Amino acid sequence: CTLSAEDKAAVERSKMIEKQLQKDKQVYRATHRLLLLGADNSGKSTIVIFETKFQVDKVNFHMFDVGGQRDERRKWIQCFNDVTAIIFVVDSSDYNRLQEALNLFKSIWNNRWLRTISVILFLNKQDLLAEKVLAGKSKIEDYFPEFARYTTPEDATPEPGEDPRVTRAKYFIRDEFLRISTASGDGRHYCYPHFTCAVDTENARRIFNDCRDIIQRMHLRQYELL
């Protein structure tokens, strides 16, 4: 083969390297990468710290929480332009921080590098939000005047033991993030709103089903069936 004895052995080393790389490739494909964005007090860590691994129905998911870098985030968001989803956690209780979260969501949703990546919004601490609505305290209309004009949608599914006031509050926040996601993007990416709590541990299953839908929709364009 016009290869010296040492050249042949080098080719053999390369082939073994290629084999380990192939087993690595299989693990990489099986693992679905997720990006846990979200602010502080969102309890982003307790939904299920730079990395976290979990497995649902024999499917392993790697969730990366990059909190070490702050300020400009678009520069390092370029790295996560291949994640299957971007779990975004929002503290429903804090309304002062809510507007900041809406701005963050808007940035993420419109980010040129995340223009085809879906977002699984997890409104967290829904319990604390309820307690605030029950005690009255700070009115949501104060922070967002539209709350008064807003009414609980008919499509809404009220959970058992939900004062319409608590119910309207929860779906008001969801409405805001939906409004933000509906304005930009054209069916390339979708937002999956899931009202969640701190005790709620079914969060992993929600991620699983939503990930199925996202990959199904992409495979529906990849196989050219759409």
Add this chain to the structure above:
Amino acid sequence: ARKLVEQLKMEANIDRIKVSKAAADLMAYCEAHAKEDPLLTPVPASENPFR
């Protein structure tokens, strides 16, 4: 603050050559090392190690 002022002072003190002279010497380098540039001057395939 005062540090920015000091940094600006130092950068102001630097001496600057005329653009003409600088551009002239860049042009000179390229012309001198022109034959030594395989990308600029197509290298005979025999020599090209990626032939």
Add this chain to the structure above:
Amino acid sequence: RQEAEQLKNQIRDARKACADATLSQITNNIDPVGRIQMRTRRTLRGHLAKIYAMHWGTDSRLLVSASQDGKLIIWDSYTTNKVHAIPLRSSWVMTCAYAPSGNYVACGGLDNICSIYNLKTREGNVRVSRELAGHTGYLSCCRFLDDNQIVTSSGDTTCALWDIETGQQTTTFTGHTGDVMSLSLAPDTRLFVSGACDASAKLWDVREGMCRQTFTGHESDINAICFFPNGNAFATGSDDATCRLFDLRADQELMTYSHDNIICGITSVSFSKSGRLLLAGYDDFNCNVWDALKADRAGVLAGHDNRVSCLGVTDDGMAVATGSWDSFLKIWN
């Protein structure tokens, strides 16, 4: 404040006085390089995820390549044989350097750590020599001066010279106000220029630790920076879809490389051994060869199916390697 803006306009008027002519006016008579048709001579396939960085070794035969799958693969370009494959602790690696000696290879990324790997060990396995950990932001670039000194740029707006043996930052460079994205060591290895997201490029002295000169002109983040072979000029690449050649001595931009069709930022920039050609990698899934002196697009290296993240020209100037998010690296020649 008032003194500050006074000094600023003072610097501005000085540069103007030195702006007697333009590089374009000067080279108006220089004959164009002509069409530079370069074809893919090799394609190094094997990376599982997007290639984010690459560096040619001084031998101009071996090159390291970083990927988001957390693997640094050393490749024998001449024979497309994978020499070594280093598993990395953090999968998110944004930069990879190759030591001039060839004995070490360093990588870094969102881990905020620059890990030096001793390629030549007696045990025969690549082992992490030292893990530099002082930086507080993603490391965007890392280039070696010695097998004991390495300059690393980080998104903490600061660059730093480290002593691999001690593991301590010998010198810190805190002048930039935005995330430093790239760094380029001068051929003389005495000065290093760094481009940041503040649309500013600062030339630093590695032994004094101070910012000698500050160059501006880009309208957005300087994603890439490279030094002209003479060490007297540096070219930059920004999201402004423009490339700008600034001269160190003149302290003033000489030529801008922009085409109306181009509306995508430059991810990586590099010069030829003579510096006549400026090969820059754009986000249009291709790389454009610009005649530096004449500011004309001589040719296009279009063989990628994703953003060309990295571009490197061999030290002998024989070939140009280009890595992309398509998980493939092509040695154009």
Add this chain to the structure above:
Amino acid sequence: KPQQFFGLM
């Protein structure tokens, strides 16, 4: 058979 028709898949 001459009167037989022959067909191929």
Add this chain to the structure above:
Amino acid sequence: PNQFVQPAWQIVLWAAAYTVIVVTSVVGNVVVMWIILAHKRMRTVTNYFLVNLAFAEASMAAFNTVVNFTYAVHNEWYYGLFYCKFHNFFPIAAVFASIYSMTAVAFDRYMAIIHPLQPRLSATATKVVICVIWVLALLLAFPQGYYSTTETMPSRVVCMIEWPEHPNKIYEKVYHICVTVLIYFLPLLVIGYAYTVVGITLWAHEQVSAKRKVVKMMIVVVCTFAICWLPFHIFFLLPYINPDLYLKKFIQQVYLAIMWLAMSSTMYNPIIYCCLNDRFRLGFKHA
């Protein structure tokens, strides 16, 4: 005297329709192959099975049809003993190849919609499956080529398959029965079941219109495969039931009809690609 000398006008009409199908199908499938290979954007591991399907279908319409039709004009073999063995090998293999390529695209489409998280078939494994399909095709067509002979009848050369002589014609009958079950009932079941479940989930708001379109496409494919190939199989199993029908002349026109319906299947896939997908349509209008 050869009784199968159909009148000139009969020849003209049959020629016309056959010609239309052949031309349209081969051009269409060839364009499909071009779109996928030329535009490397559409050239993906996913489209490899699609490539295999298109290629096999194109070769089928080009070889199997024209050759068989000219044979049916007066049942005369205007080729040679080599071509008799070749036609009873390549075109026949291409039939089985196309049907098994349809099972392959259907399996990927099942795995991509029913189990979206599980990764796609590896690129190497995808090529392995294509190889296996063509291998099985050649194996199923081998007996016919092995027992090929150009009996030179005074009336006309006839390429006939001289199966091992049996009083009960056991080997002859079993082979044709096995082919029918292996390239009709078996695919009709797998392609059927798979496309059925995918259809159920996709059927169960612009997205909805597109998903229900895919369901329409799948049911079209299943019905085509079942309806178009059934007359074909019946004709080739007829000698075992009623050989006297073969000895009559009308069977000549019946063979023409069954081959027309069967070869027409190689046209459905191109039209379906342009109708369901937008990128395929763009490539078609570009060519």
Add this chain to the structure above:
Amino acid sequence: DVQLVESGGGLVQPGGSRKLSCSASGFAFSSFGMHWVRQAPEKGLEWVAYISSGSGTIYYADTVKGRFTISRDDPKNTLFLQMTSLRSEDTAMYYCVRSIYYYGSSPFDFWGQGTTLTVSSDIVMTQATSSVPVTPGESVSISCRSSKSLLHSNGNTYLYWFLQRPGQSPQLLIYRMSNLASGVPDRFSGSGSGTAFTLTISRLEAEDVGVYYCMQHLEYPLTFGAGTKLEL
């Protein structure tokens, strides 16, 4: 530290069978292809067998072809040599050598201590001078000629120089004609013309006493030279 202790030798009646075992410690046995090289009590070195990394390519020498078999237990970091039909010509000390092969590698770098077994077309490497008397401080030039040019088209002349100091396993001095091995003083220098090669040892010391062997790696079977002794 890198050690390759081999064991399992001793007196064996002719026609018998024995398994030699080289236990590895301090390196990635899996990544290093291993070789077995023997030395007759009075003669020089002779390549016996070679197993590649991952037990892939297993070449053998003509003399031991079939009779001997080399096998590697990567998990247990051990190299085995089951030898059958032991002829009286197999009486020798067997050395297990490690060899990694990549661009810029140093094959045949570490040699094991050696185990003694007492049994009751290929390129010819010609070291003309069997012995050369020399006093310390002088400069020697051990020469080695080849039947075929060892310069492959890849531009690498595959000629390796080894030094067996009295009562010690051989040690790689110069790999690929000129490249000096690690841990070797700079006084050793390798020159070559493709067919004729020369190892120049300047400022000779007491440590440099021993026999010098020239091995070719152009093709298998690997062939060692007769050996040139440097006596003080």
